[PDB]
Every structure is written in C-alpha cells, then in structure tokens.
C-alpha cells in the first residue's frame, strides 16, 4: 500500500513519545511526521505549514496547540481553504469553534458546535428550573448562530422560558465612554448566557463585577472557548461560573492525534477505493493562483464520514464533531474548575441536585 504524508503539528510542551506510542488495514498508509512549533502568530503558522507542504508531500494536517487563542482556528481555516488541504484542529485554540468557515475549507475541529452548546446550556437551566435569563455576546463570529439557536429553541417550547434581554457588546472600540458598563447595568435576570472569547470575557466580568452582577443571585454560563485551558483561570472570572467544556479530561491528546491520523488516512483510502485517485499534495502555497482549476475540496465527503475502531468519528458539514462527550464544569471557591456534569447521548447527567455555595 502507498503512503500519504500527514503532518502533526504540536504547539507547546508535548509528550511527543506518549503521542507516537499511542498510535491501518486500508488501501493507503500514513507517513506521519511530527513538526513542533513555538509560535502561533499568522506568519509563523502560515510559513511553517507552507514550508512543510513544499519540503514534503502532505495529504493533510493534524494540529494541536496549548493556547487559548481562537484566532488560530481562523488562520487554519484560511490556510486550509487557500491550499485546499485538510486541517484538523484537535486541541487548544485550533479547536475553538469557528463559525462560518470558508465555502472551500477542509478544516474540521474537535469540539462542540455553537448550536450544540446552546442546547446543552438550556438543558442545564431546565434541570434547575432556571427559566428566566438574559444573553450577552460580542461580535465574535457565531454570536448570531448562538442567539438564534436559543431563540429558536425556546419559541418552540411548552416551557415557560423568559428571555428578558439580549446585549450585543462592541469591543472593537475602546471603553472610555463607559458604554459597556451602561449596557451591563441593564441586566436584571438571574441567569446570564455569555458568548464571547476568553480574553473578552475577562474584561466583561471585570465590568460586570464593578456593577454587582457576579455575586450571589447571578449565575453566568459560558461556552467551551471562554473556559478554554482550565489550568489557566483569569482572576476576574467569578466563582460560580458554569461552563460547557471539551478540554480534554477523558479524551486525551494522544488519542486525538491517533484519530486525526486515522480520519485523514481512512478518508483518503475511501476516495482512492472509489475514484482510483486522491488529490495531489500541493507543491506550494505560492502557486495557488495558478493551480486553482486543478484542485478541489472533493476529499471532504469522506473526511466527514469516517468510522474507525468502533467509533463514529463523523463531522458535520459545518466542520465540528458530531457526537462529543461534553463535561460541564464549575469554577469553585478555590478558583479551580470542577466537574459537575456530563453530556452523553443527548442526555444531561448532572452531579448536584441542588447547587452548593459557601
């Protein structure tokens, strides 16, 4: 069987040996090379992947980082779309949900859709009869998909939901006019759903605290990307913060790099065993204006429908994992993120029946 080149890119300290040791009967076999990378600015990420693609024949990329940088996902989608190369963001910033990927991206992310986390958050509220709430977002892509999902869910519900306020915070401008404070002051609800980036949340919580919305009587629920790396907990995050989370309790990096390589390899085998060809690895990034009509996102049908070793590793067409096991976590009195629920098979299994405090 012929070999396809798969680059695995690891940003930040990594048990490269735990990863290699942790990992194919198909029509094609992986030749995996671990690149390590120290920086996650656009230039560093672009040049590194472009150099790989030219100093070697790369069928696909598996990407993992240890940052809280959702921009990495944006960058990877762009790179993927431009070079029509499959990139899997399996951990860290690379995995933080990017809404509205390019039409011709081949970029897939380990972690929950925006719509899925929205529904998980309503399930949490239903469990504890928290029927009265407001939403706060920034303009961070997804924010509409988030608000819509909520609205759509609760307008179709026999339950007595009361969505009091939706706030849209513009943090592309400075806050010298104390504008965002004045918006936050308008919140009355006891539950608050917040959609934004980790770095944005940091600031919003600082302000929210200053006008007395972080204490008892207010509960905030945020999505994975706000919590991000749970070993890193901004000081401004309020105790009693609830988050959905796919950050790597039961599904460890080694096992993901395993599946990433599996997904890409299988996908290629499936295409070859039906079309008698796979897409030729791109010679470079610097000749993609020329080779346009010769390239395709054909390989996507297969990438999103891989079953390997008993697990359905399917993606959505929107580019996220289909059936992730999600952990619900709570930021406790010791400023440590604590596991208080699971979300498994569309059922929510919470720890507490009544929430404790202190």
């Amino acid at each position: 069987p012929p070999s396809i080149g798969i680059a695995v890119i690891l940003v930040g300290t990594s048990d490269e040996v735990a990863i290699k040791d942790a990992h194919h009967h198909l029509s094609v076999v992986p030749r995996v090379e671990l690149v390590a990378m120290n920086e996650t600015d656009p230039k560093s990420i672009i040049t590194r992947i472009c150099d790989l693609m030219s100093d070697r024949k790369i069928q696909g990329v598996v990407f993992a980082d240890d940052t809280d940088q959702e921009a990495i996902a944006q960058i990877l989608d762009f790179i993927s779309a431009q070079t029509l190369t499959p990139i899997l963001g399996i951990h860290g910033g690379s995995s933080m949900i990017m809404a509205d990927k390019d039409e011709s991206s081949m970029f897939f992310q380990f972690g929950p859709s925006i719509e899925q986390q929205a529904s998980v958050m309503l399930n949490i509220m239903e469990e504890y009869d928290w029927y009265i709430f407001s939403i706060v977002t920034t303009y961070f892509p997804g924010y509409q998909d988030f608000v819509n999902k909520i609205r759509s869910t609760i307008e179709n519900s026999f339950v007595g939901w009361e969505l009091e306020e939706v706030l849209l915070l513009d943090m592309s401008l400075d806050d010298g006019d104390s504008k965002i404070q004045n918006q936050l002051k308008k919140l009355q609800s006891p539950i608050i759903l917040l959609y934004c980036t980790k770095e944005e949340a940091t600031y919003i919580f600082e302000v929210a605290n200053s006008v007395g919305l972080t204490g008892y009587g207010y509960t905030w629920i945020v999505p994975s990307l706000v919590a991000g790396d749970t070993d890193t907990v901004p000081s401004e995050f309020p105790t009693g913060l609830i988050s959905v989370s796919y950050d790597e309790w039961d599904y460890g990096l080694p096992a993901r790099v395993r599946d990433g390589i599996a997904i890409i390899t299988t996908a290629a085998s499936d295409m070859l065993s039906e079309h008698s060809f796979i897409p030729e690895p791109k010679s470079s990034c610097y000749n993609t204006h020329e080779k346009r009509i010769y390239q395709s996102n054909m390989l996507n049908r297969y990438l999103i429908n891989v079953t390997f070793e008993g697990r359905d590793l399917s993606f959505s067409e929107d580019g996220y994992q289909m059936h992730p096991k999600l952990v619900i976590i709570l930021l406790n009195k010791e400023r440590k993120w604590e596991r208080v629920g699971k979300w498994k098979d569309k059922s929510l299994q919470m720890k507490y029946y009544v929430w404790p405090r202190m």
Binding site: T40, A71, L173, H289
Partner: protein
C-alpha cells in the same frame, strides 16, 4: 527629532505608491509635526491571498503601521487577507475602492473603514428618488446572495422608517430562466421595479423582462451601478435609471482623502494619554495592539469636509457617508447623466429623463 509613525498601504501600482508617499509628505507639511510625524510604507497587491497576508506581516506590520490603506486591484484578489491579518492585531484598515457589502460585517472585519460606500447604500438614493418622483409602490427584485439581501435590508429599513414595497422577490444567483420570477412581478399592480444583481445576473433579468414585455411603457426600472456595467449595459432596456459612484474608481483621489483623514486622526490620537505602539512584526506576537480599538473610535468619528471625493464621514459600520452619485439614464442606448445625488440632495440637471417607452 520627532516620533515617527508609519502609515501602511497596499495599492495597485507603483504610480499609486508614489501618490501615497506624496500624500503623506503633504500631511506632514500641512500639520504641526514636531511631536509626531508620519512615514509612508507601502506595497502592491501580491498574486494570491496567502502571499498577500505574509507581505502584510513582513513589509507593513514589521514597520509598526498604525493603519493600512487598501485598494481594489486591477485583476480574485480582495482586501480580505489584509483585513484579517491587520485585524488580528486590531490595526485599522481603510478600504479605498471596495464596495461589496460584506465588508460592513463587523464579525468578519473588525477594524475596517472605507472611503467609498457599499453597494447596498444605493438604496439611500433610490429612496430619495421614490420621494422625489412619488413612486409610493415598488417591486424589489434582488439576488439571493449577501449583496442582494444587503440592498433589501437597507431599503426596507428606510421604508419601515410614505412609500412602500409591494413585494420582494429573490432569485438564485446564476439563473438564466427568470421568466417564472418576473411573471410573479408582472401580476402585481406596481410598475416600478428596483433591481439588485451582479452584472451577469442583471443581464438574465433584462432579457427575460424583455420577452415578457415588461421593459416598455408603464414600467420604471431603477437599478444601481453593477446592473448598468459591462454586459448588463449591453442588454439593459432603454429608459432604465441607474447609478455611478462619482470617483468610485479613482484610487488616486481616495488615497488623497484617506491619508488626510488618517493623518488628522493620528494627531487627534496623540492628544490622548497612554498611547502604545503597534507590535513590531508578526512573528512571536499574538496579543492585540492595546491602542487599536481607541484609534478605531477616533477614525470613526473623523470628519473631513473639504475632501476630494466630498464630505468624509463614517457611519456605525465604518462605511462612507455623504457619497456622491451620478444618476444615469439609458437614452437611445447611450448612458446619459440626468442628475446627481450630492450626499443628501437630488439635483436634477437640464438633460430630460426618458422613461421606458417615452
């Protein structure tokens, strides 16, 4: 020795690079430049998006540019990679000639103003014509893409602010047999038809409308700039009214005004306290420019009345206000100017309008 503050530019030709230099030199002559003094740093569009993004890092952000002017090239290459890469750092981008409405989306383009309006803003002119010529009932046909729906959104806002839209019809971009859609329009009483469509799509509409005898007397056709350009012009019914953005394609003019605005804004920025520099280069830098969002506010509030393309202000999206349009009328198959929208007022000239039929 003053402090040297770089402005950046990505421009079509080296003639325009030289115009940008001379514009910045003039600003330095015109302003009090003992404390701060500007320096022009520029570059022409690269042949593809990934190369362009890199160039922004290597050539521009490496010089710590406070802002970046961008034009629409002559040959598939958009400002988008410049907006992304600059946006990563919250360095503002000033679009000179880009007119697609998508650039008004804050989620996709954080730090993007422009000195020309999006196409959707042609609704402003339509609306003032509808008041003027007392068209109180209109049909509105629009392409079902971002741009088409942008025009609908914008017109409808002005109507739900009196004239009304009796119906709104959307067609799939790329369709040629629009007889189905236009028959639906034929059956309504309103005989004033407003069209938002690309060149090729407007051609399809124009042909189908002619077969159905909807281009004759009775009917008023009111379109924008794209719909009387190139191949659209070549089938457009006689009597049609359309628009051309005055100086809309004078890169040189918009460089002159852009630099004036940006220069003003820089000096206004440095009246304020605790101004930080942008990051020197991309490599190793992943934090936003702390002062970026403040500088964006300053730019947004920038008023430059005595500008070459008229009165420069920006709306809440950073799109140009007070743009000026030629009101064009197809007469015996020649495009003839019958008036201008001067920013706020319709000024009919002495050349008589000839409607379809008459």
């Amino acid at each position: 020795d003053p402090k040297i503050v770089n402005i950046g530019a990505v421009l079509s030709t080296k003639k325009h690079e030289q115009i940008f230099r001379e514009a910045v030199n003039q600003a330095n002559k015109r302003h009090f430049t003992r404390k701060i003094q500007l320096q022009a740093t520029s570059v022409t569009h690269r042949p593809n998006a990934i190369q362009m993004a890199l160039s922004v890092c290597e050539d521009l952000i490496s010089s710590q540019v406070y802002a970046i002017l961008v034009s629409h090239p002559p040959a598939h290459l958009t400002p988008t990679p410049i907006s992304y890469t600059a946006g990563f750092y919250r360095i503002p981008v000033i679009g000179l000639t880009t007119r697609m409405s998508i650039y008004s989306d804050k989620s996709i383009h954080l730090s993007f103003l422009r000195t020309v309006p999006p196409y959707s803003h042609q609704a402003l002119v339509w609306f003032e014509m509808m008041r003027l010529f007392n068209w109180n009932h209109v049909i509105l046909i629009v392409s079902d893409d971002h741009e088409g729906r942008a025009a609908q959104k914008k017109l409808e806002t002005l109507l739900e602010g009196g004239p009304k839209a009796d119906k709104v019809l959307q067609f799939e971009p790329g369709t040629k047999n629009l007889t189905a859609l236009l028959l639906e329009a034929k059956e309504l009483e309103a005989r004033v038809i407003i069209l938002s469509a690309s060149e090729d799509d407007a051609t399809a509409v124009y042909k189908s409308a002619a077969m159905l005898d909807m281009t004759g007397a009775g009917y008023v056709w009111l379109v924008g700039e794209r719909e009387i350009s190139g191949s659209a012009l070549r089938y457009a019914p006689d009597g049609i009214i359309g628009l051309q953005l005055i100086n809309g394609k004078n890169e040189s003019a918009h460089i002159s005004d852009a630099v004036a605005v940006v220069a003003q804004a820089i000096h206004e920025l440095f009246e304020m306290e605790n101004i930080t520099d942008p990051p020197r280069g991309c490599v190793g830098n992943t934090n936003i420019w702390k002062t970026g969002p403040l500088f964006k506010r300053v730019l947004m509030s920038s008023k430059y009345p005595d500008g070459v393309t008229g009165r420069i202000e920006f709306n809440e999206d950073g799109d140009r206000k007070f743009a000026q349009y030629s009101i064009m009328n197809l007469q015996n198959r020649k495009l003839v100017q019958v008036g201008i929208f001067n920013g706020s007022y319709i000024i009919q000239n002495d050349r008589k309008i000839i409607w379809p039929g008459g």
